[PDB]
Amino acid sequence: MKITVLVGGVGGARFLLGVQNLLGLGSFADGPSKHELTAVVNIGDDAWMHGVRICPDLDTCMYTLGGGIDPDRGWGHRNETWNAKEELAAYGVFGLGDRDLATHLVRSQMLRAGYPLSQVTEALCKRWQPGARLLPASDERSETHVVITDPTDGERRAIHFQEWWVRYRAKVPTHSFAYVGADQATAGPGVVEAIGDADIVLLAPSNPVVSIGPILQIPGIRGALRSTSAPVIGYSPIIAGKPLRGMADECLKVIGVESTSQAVGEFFGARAGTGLLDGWLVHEGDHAQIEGVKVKAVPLLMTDPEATAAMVRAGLDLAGVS
Amino acid sequence: MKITVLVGGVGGARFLLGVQNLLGLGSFADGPSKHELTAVVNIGDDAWMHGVRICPDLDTCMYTLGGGIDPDRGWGHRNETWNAKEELAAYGVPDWFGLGDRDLATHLVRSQMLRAGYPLSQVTEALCKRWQPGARLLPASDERSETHVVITDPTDGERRAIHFQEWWVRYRAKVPTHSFAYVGADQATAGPGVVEAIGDADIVLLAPSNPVVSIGPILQIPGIRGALRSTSAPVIGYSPIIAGKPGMADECLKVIGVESTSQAVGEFFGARAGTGLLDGWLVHEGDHAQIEGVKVKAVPLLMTDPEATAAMVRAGLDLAGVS
Ligand SMILES: [Ca+2]
Ligand SMILES: [Ca+2]
Ligand SMILES: [Ca+2]
C-alpha cells in the first residue's frame, strides 16, 4: 500500500495527481484510503532570491495536489497579482506572485528559526493538505547550476539553472551542469526509508537531467534506489508525434544525449547493470530496447488525472505489483 | 543653503514637503537647486515582521517626497493590494499588521541588503535612487533603537513590554500604559552624517510630529542630543498641539505625565539657554505659551497643503532670523 515517486517540475506534480486519482488519495478521496503516497521532490531549482527561500518543485506539488493552481493558466495561484514583482523591477533588480511571496515569507522564517526544509514543508502542507508526503530530496543545499561561457569576458561561469533558463539558454555556449552542494548533502529525512520500504518506486516523466537527475546527485539516494526490493519503473518524457516532430530537449543537449526514449532509458540504465531501472515505459508508437530492462509502449500523455491514472496502472502491471 | 529637520510620522513627511516647496526642491524643482534639505528620521518604530525589516518613518518620507504615498491613509503605497497579507492569514500566522504587496518589495530589498551587511543609511540611499525624494533621508541611527511600551496585558493582567507597533496598531493605546522605553538608544551611535547635518545647518527644525514617540526617540540617541546642544544653528520647534480641536499624541503625553498643551510640550524639549533644546517655538493661531529662553510666536500651523506648510517653514526661518 506504499508508493514512492521521484518528482520534479510541472510534470512531476501532474503525475502524482494521477497516482492520487488511481488510489483515491487527496482531492480524489471518497472514504479514507488504503494507500499512502510518498514523493521524493527535487530541490535542484531551490534558491535564495530577494532574501527569501524559493522551492519551486516542492511548491508545485503542494499547490497542485492541494487544489491551488489556476486551471486556466496551469501555473500559480488563482486571483494572483504581481504587484510586488512590479515594484521590484522599479527598484531595478520565477514569476514571484504576491500570493506566492507569502509562502516564501513563512518558509524563510521557519528556516531561519532552525526548522529543516522537511519540517517547513509539513508545516505548509497543514494548510494545503496535499494528501501526499512531500519529502525534499535533501534538507541541505543542492542547487543545480549551468556552466556557460560568459560573453562579457569569455570566462566559464556557473549560473543557477533558473537564471540560465530564462536569460542565457540558447544565447551563449553551455558546457555542463554542476550540482552546487550535492557532495556535502545527505538524503533528507525519510527519503532512504521511503525508497527502501516501498512496494514500488516510480520516476515521474519529468526532465531526466534537471528534474529527476538532481535527486540522484544527493548522496545516499542512488544507493537506496539500487538496493531496494521495490521494483523501479521509469516513465519516458519523450512524446513523439508533435507538429514538425517537436524539438530536442535543451537540457539533454547540454550533456549530449539524444531526445529519444532509447537514450533517456540508457541514461538511467538497467539495475541489472549499474543503472536504476527495472522497467521503462514509453509512449504508444515508441520503442526502446535496453539489456536488462522491461520496456512496454502504452499511452503516456498526462491529459487529465484519469489518463495519468491509467499510466500509473500500466507501471504497476509491468512491475507485477498489486 | 542647508536646512536640517527632525522628523517622524505622516506629519514629518508633510512638513518636509513644505520645506521642499519653499526652496524649490524635489517635485517642486524649477531650475537650478540652491538649497539642500536633510531629514533626520525617527527609527524608533522600526521592527522585524515576518522576517523583513519595516522602517515606517523612513518609508513614509521616501514615498511622500517621491509621489508614491497613499493620500487616504497617509502611510503605504497608492493603489496597494493585500493579496500576500491575505495568504499569510490563510496560513494562520502576527496578523494585526498590514504588509501591502507593493510595500513588501521595499521590505524585501531592504531586508536582503541589511542581511548582506549594508548599513541602513546605505539601504536608504539605494532605495531613494528610485524615488528621487529630493532630500537626504538620514536614519537617526544605523543601529537598533526600538521604542517599547510597558503595559498591563488584559489577557492575564501581567506587566508586558510590546513594540510600539503593537501598542498603536493592535491595541490603539487603549490598554493600561505605564512607560516608554528606548531599548538600545544608549548603545546606538548617531547615523552617518546626522551629527554633521545638525552641526553644519543654517537652521534646525523639529517637525510638529509626536513629541514622545516620533521626535523624542531621536533625542534619546546620545550623539544627536549633543549635536543639537552645541550647533551654531538656531533650533526651531513646531508645537503639535492645535488645542481645542482634533491622532493620539495626546495619549503618549499622558503616559509620561505631560499635559497636552503648547506650553507643556515646549517645556518638554526645553530651552537651550537652560538644559533644553529649543531657541524658538511656534504655536497655532489663538494659542499662547512662553518659555524662559525661548522666543514663542503664534502663527498658522496647519499642514493642509504644501503651500500652507511652506509658510510654516518661512515663519520658522523668520523667528530664527535666518534668510
Ligand atoms: Ca500528433
Ligand atoms: Ca552599538
Ligand atoms: Ca535617556
Residue numbers in the entry:
A (entry chain A): 1 to 93, 98 to 326
B (entry chain B): 1 to 93, 95 to 247, 250 to 326
What does the paper say about this structure?
F420 is a low-potential redox cofactor used by diverse bacteria and archaea. In mycobacteria, this cofactor has multiple roles, including adaptation to redox stress, cell wall biosynthesis, and activation of the clinical antitubercular prodrugs pretomanid and delamanid. To determine the structural basis of dehydro-F420-0 production, we solved high-resolution crystal structures of the enzyme responsible (FbiA) in apo-, substrate-, and product-bound forms. The crystal structure of FbiA shows that this enzyme employs a flexible active site to capture Fo and EPPG, precisely positioning them for catalysis.
In order to resolve the catalytic mechanism of DH-F420-0 synthesis, purified FbiA was crystallized, and its structure was determined at 2.3 Å by X-ray crystallography. FbiA crystallized as a dimer mediated by the interaction of three α-helices and a β-sheet. This dimer is predicted to be stable by the protein-interaction prediction program PISA, and the molecular weight of FbiA determined by size exclusion chromatography coupled to multiangle light scattering (SEC-MALS) shows that it forms a dimer in solution. The structure of CofD from M. mazei, a homologous enzyme that instead utilizes LPPG derived from 2PL as its substrate, also crystallized as a dimer with an analogous interface to FbiA. The crystal structure of FbiA reveals an active site with open and closed states.
